[PDB]
Design a protein around this ligand. Structure first.
Ligand code: UL8
Length: 113
């Protein structure tokens, strides 16, 4: 198995973990695209040029869209950055993002070489 395949299986494992019951208490705001209209965030799409969420990452992984781990990481980090850009840093969703990003970053660091 090639290194890109092996690294994308590590990425797929991380993605499975981020969507797992273990992290659900803080991962759930990142499961589906932000429904700005439903949440009354009528400025969301003016501020966030590139929306990203774990369902979109899962679809891109299933569709073999990601060519390497770096591409996968960039979407997961884009999702967190969107949260930090839109939200005051003392808001509950930001605490949830920080916790889920901690799970992501520590396991992404264990990438097989
Ligand atoms: C700048 C002020 N921010 C918001 O008004 C706001 C409100 C709700 C959000 O999402 C719902 C799913 C939520 C609810 C409770 C706890 C946590 C989240 C969000 C939101 C969701 N995401 C991914 N980013 N912001 C922002």
């Amino acid at each position: 198995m090639g290194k890109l395949s092996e690294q994308l299986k590590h990425c797929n494992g991380i993605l499975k973990e981020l969507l797992s019951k273990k992290h659900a208490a803080y991962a759930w705001p990142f499961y589906k695209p932000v429904d700005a209209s439903a949440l009354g965030l009528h400025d969301y799409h003016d501020i966030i040029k590139h929306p990203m969420d774990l369902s979109t990452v899962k679809r891109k992984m299933e569709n073999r869209d990601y060519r390497d781990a770096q591409e996968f990481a960039a979407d997961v980090r884009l999702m967190f950055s969107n949260c930090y850009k839109y939200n005051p840093p003392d808001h509950d969703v930001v605490a949830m993002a920080r916790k889920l990003q901690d799970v992501f970053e520590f396991r992404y660091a264990k990438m097989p070489d």
